RNA sequence: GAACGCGCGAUACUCUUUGAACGCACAUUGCGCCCCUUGGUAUUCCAGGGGGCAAGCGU
RNA sequence: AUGCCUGAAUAGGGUGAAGCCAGAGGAAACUCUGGUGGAGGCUCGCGAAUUUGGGUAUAGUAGCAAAUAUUCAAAUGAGAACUUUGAAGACUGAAGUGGGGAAAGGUUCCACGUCAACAGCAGUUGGACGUGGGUUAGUCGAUCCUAAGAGAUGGUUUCAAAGGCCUGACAGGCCACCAUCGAAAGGGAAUCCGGUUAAGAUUCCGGAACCUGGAUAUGGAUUCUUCACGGUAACGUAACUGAAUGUGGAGACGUCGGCGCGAGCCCUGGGAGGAGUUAUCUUUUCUUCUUAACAGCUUAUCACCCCGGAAUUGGUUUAUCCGGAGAUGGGGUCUUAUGGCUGGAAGAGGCCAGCACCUUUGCUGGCUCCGGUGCGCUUGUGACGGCCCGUGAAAAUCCACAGGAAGGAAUAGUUUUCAUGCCAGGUCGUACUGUC
């Protein structure tokens, strides 16, 4: 996940079972004040949801991870 | 594989063909 | 055809009692 | 992808508000006469397509290169 | 000195199966540190890991 | 060169096909000598028409 | 009574998904409709939230 | 025992039935001879049997758990017949001991550490143990539709008041017919290539592209002001309004045979590289020389149209079928399946050679070209011919046709199936193995 953050400009988050891509995108935008390019969500074997939120080129994911 | 999970009781007693449970009788 | 659907049951019964 | 044979159409494509970059690609290839020559492809992508202009004439390619907007980024090869 | 994963990665990177890869018997320690495909590619470039040619047998 | 369909059939269906062929041959041989096995057309030919039947009754 | 979670239920050592179980289906986290409201350029679009849906040839 | 719905399979060798062609005998009927053709209760490897998935009805003894072949050197480790690397010997031999899927299993996938138990000797090994990491979709499936059948409403549309829509400065009018479930093999809108991880890919990254829905703007057309033209015709077009109502097409449909064509594979010549063998001979043996979805131009057998009027009967298939119900012949129209050129695209991928370093140590330079072939295998497709038979499942979905309701002009008339431009695409499955 940290490799994706520093290389792919993608923040990897854990979200709830009841959240869809719209809600994840809006929550990321509101909580971290960043522009979201796309959201890709999967369901993990342990019953949790993992979301790859790729931000726009105007933002550096390393800066948001450090901040 | 004659039986599957029953929603009402959680046992492997829901007959797939009959669509009835042999342990709690659902529904 | 089946034209009886032009009369509901209550209308038909209340007209049968008229006879 | 689309191919265009019109030079002024290519110039109009590169003059729009939403233009990012134009690519100039050089190919050293032989013609049917057997003498090799220099072929230049000018590529710019419009709204949803990539338009390519192929020029087999060196002088025309030089003139088109000189006629490109000075504020347009050009990728050499 | 357990280079099973190294052989698997070399076969995958070179794409010639595990029957065509050659790991240097005199460089066990160096190959043992190649835990990633980038290191496998570096070893192949350096000649520590080599790709064997197809058998010379008439059709 | 053997075709793919031939390979598939010989690998899958040859044995039971041969067994059923053998059983059919055995049954036909067994009932060849029995009496009481006739086709419908042959039964009608032996029965004859109506007029043939009044002729026989007379 | 069951499932999933931290005795308890997202306020988790108020009350998730269900169950007589109730919008419709169901071996699916599938498919709708209605009313209010909020946001993203916004009268149209998209999404989020709250609350709901088991007349007469008679007198 | 008999079934029903939707799929897979129904192969190969041999023989050679009708029908047809050319001959001979005969007044015909016919009978022989050669070919063609490719059929079957044909053969080969009252009774029995009649492929298959999903759905759905009526004593430290016996013994070693049996699947063949192992050997040498080195590394790790306290410990090596069993772990790892190299060398040798051997095996599966595309109908695999090779790569994937449905179902099913549920973390068995990957990494690190370990041998208390387990893997019927051992083990430093593991489908074991302990700790972590890993499954990314507008385009692939489910989700949608209906099939046999199941099943609410009052047994499956029945003596049920079972519902929506339209018109008009509440009344009138139109129409009929029943919910829902049931397929990850049936029907169905749309994505490809390259690269990338220890474990993820049509899902990620780069490039390139399509589908559906929506609001809108601009250009063009709608030519005197009001819904456009051309050709004898088949029909062509950048457009070129169209209500109720009534229809048509696609979806949408048995099986077999030969013939023609395309693609992938196989075979093969020259040349440009790299590798092997060489006591002797061998211009020699192996390997690289690739082009995706999508897009533009062009390209057709069949069918149809026009002229014309045919016996001295012609045309013609491998298969004897066609012509005054219009042949041969001459000239045209159409479907774009499928080839060709081009963009995507050489910048990718591949094969080489050279120069840098106790290190992520990547930089540079070349070649990636031109052809031939078929009772060959795989697959798609076209026109036919044969046989069985309900004219060969239904529905969602898209399109068109008749009809003539209504609407359209003087500081932006009407339409926008022509062109360009804007936005968006949720939920669940995705790791690994694997009776059909």
Task: Detail the protein residues whose CB sits closer than 7 A to any atom belonging to strand G.
Answer: A 16-18, 20, 22-23, 26, 46-47; B 4, 7-10, 14, 16, 19, 26-27; C 8, 10-11, 14-15, 17-18
Q: What is the CATH number of the domain that holds E24?
A: 1.10.1650.10
Nucleotide lying nearest to B5, CA to C1' measure:
G27
Residue list, annotated binding site of B: 6, 9, 21, 24
**To which H or E segment does residue F7 belong?**
helix F4-12
Asked if residue E58 is part of any domain, the answer here is: no
The C-alpha atoms of residue B25 and residue A27 are separated, in whole angstroms, by 45
Which letter, b or e, does each residue of D4-18 get, where b requires 16 or more Cβ atoms within 10 Å of its Cβ?
Answer: eeeeeebbebbeeee
Domain count, chain E: 1
Q: What is the span of the domain harbouring residue E16?
A: 3-51
The spacing between the Cα labelled CA in D55 and the C1' in H34, in angstroms, equals: 69
Which string of DSSP letters, residue by residue, matches F33-57?
A: S-SS---HHHHHHHH--HHHHHHHH
The spacing between the Cα labelled CA in F6 and the C1' in H22, in angstroms, equals: 39
Closest CA to D57 of D35, D30, D37, D29: D37
The C-alpha atoms of residue C10 and residue A16 are separated, in whole angstroms, by 58
Question: Measured over all CA atoms, what is the biggest interatomic distance in chain F, rounded to whole angstroms?
Answer: 71
Enter the DSSP assignment of B11: S
Question: Dihedrals φ, ψ of E58, to 5°?
Answer: -65, 145
- Which chain E residues 25-44 have CB under 7 A to strand H? 25, 28, 35-38, 42
Closest CA to A5 of A32, A26, A27: A32
Q: Does A26 sit behind a cis peptide bond, omega within 30 degrees of 0 on the bond before it? A: no
Closest CA to D36 of D19, D21, D58, D54: D58
**Alpha-carbon distances of E33 from E3, E10, E22, E29, E40, rounded to whole Å:** 9, 13, 17, 7, 9
The full set of domain ranges for chain D reads: 1-77
Question: Dihedrals φ, ψ of D30, to 5°?
Answer: -95, 150
Asked if residue E22 is part of any domain, the answer here is: yes
The C-alpha atoms of residue B6 and residue D4 are separated, in whole angstroms, by 65
Resolution of this model in Å is 3.0
CA angle E14, E18, E23 (to 5 degrees): 75
Token pair of A65 as six digits: 């991870």
């Amino acid at each position: 996940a940290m490799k994706k953050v520093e290389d792919g400009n993608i923040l990897v988050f854990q979200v709830s079972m009841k959240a869809n891509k719209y809600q994840i995108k809006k929550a990321v935008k509101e909580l971290y004040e960043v522009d979201v390019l796309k959201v890709n969500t999967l369901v993990r074997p342990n019953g949790t949801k993992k979301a790859y939120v790729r931000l726009t080129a105007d933002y550096d994911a390393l800066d948001i991870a450090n901040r | 594989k004659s039986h599957t999970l029953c929603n009402r009781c959680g046992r492997r007693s829901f007959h797939v063909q009959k669509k009835t449970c042999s342990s709690c009788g659902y529904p | 055809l089946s034209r009886y659907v032009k009369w509901p049951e209550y209308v038909r019964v209340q007209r049968q009692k008229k006879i | 992808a689309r191919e265009i044979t019109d030079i002024k159409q290519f110039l109009e494509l590169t003059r729009r508000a939403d233009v990012k970059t134009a690519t100039v690609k050089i190919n050293k290839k032989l013609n049917k006469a057997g003498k090799p020559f220099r072929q230049t492809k000018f590529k710019v992508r419009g709204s949803s397509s990539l338009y390519t202009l192929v020029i087999n004439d060196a002088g025309k390619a030089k003139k088109l290169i000189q006629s490109l907007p000075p504020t347009l980024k050009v990728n050499r090869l | 000195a357990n280079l099973r994963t190294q052989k698997r990665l070399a076969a995958s990177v070179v794409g010639v199966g595990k029957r065509k890869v050659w790991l240097d018997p005199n460089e066990t320690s160096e190959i043992a540190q190649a835990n990633s495909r980038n290191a496998i590619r570096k070893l192949v470039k350096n000649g520590t890991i080599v790709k064997k040619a197809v058998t010379v047998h008439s059709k | 060169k053997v075709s793919k369909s031939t390979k598939k059939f010989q690998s899958k269906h040859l044995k039971h096909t041969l067994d059923q062929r053998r059983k059919e041959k055995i049954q036909k041989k067994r009932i060849q000598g029995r009496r009481g096995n006739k086709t419908d057309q042959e039964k009608a030919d032996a029965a004859g028409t109506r007029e043939q039947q009044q002729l026989k009754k007379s």
